[PDB]
């Protein structure tokens, strides 16, 4: 099954917008983690494939997903990086869990319609 870029934009970008709309939880995910700004030089020792909302949005805008599961996988890469690097008590970690709950609800009917 071949998916057109605008078909993927129209279907998937609302699920990404739902994540952006989460306040306070989306704020640290709207731009790439910057270990220099944050003073965490070990970040890229632990996270080998960084991901964030702005990168996912650019990939969707530029047709880099051929197939909707590739988009789902990048969203979960974002989540898994945050749960891997951050402490269980940290805001980023708890905010990530909220973003995953929101994403689960938004993506479910969308994937069904893309099938
Ligand atoms: C240019 O915009 C800015 C640049 C950077 C800022 N940034 C902060 C700042 C640093 C100062 C202390 C503080 O408290 N920060 C802070 C913490 C939060 C928290 F989410 F923890 F509540 C929210 C905010 C904000 F966005 F409201 F401003 C700032 N720490 C971050 C952690 C991550 C992260 C992830 C994901 N994975 O691993 C990590 C690590 C990513 C971004 C972060 C967010 C926005």
Author numbering: 1083 to 1197
Study authors write:
Many proteins, including the EP300/CBP histone acetyltransferases (HATs), contain several targetable domains. EP300 and CBP broadly regulate the activity of other proteins through their protein acetyltransferase catalytic activity. These proteins contain several highly homologous domains, including KIX, bromodomains (BRDs) and HAT domains, through which they interact with, dock to, and acetylate target proteins, respectively. EP300/CBP are critical gene-regulatory targets in cancer, with existing high potency inhibitors of either the catalytic HAT domain or protein-binding bromodomain (BRD). Using crystallography, we identify the binding mechanism of the EP300/CBP-specific BRD inhibitor CCS1477 in complex with the EP300, CBP and BRD4 BRDs, and define components of the CCS1477 catalytic binding core that are required for compound activity.
Since recombinant CBP BRD was more robust in biochemical assays and crystallization studies, Kd values were determined for all compound-CBP interactions by MST, and co-crystal structures of the CBP BRD with five of the seven analogues were determined.
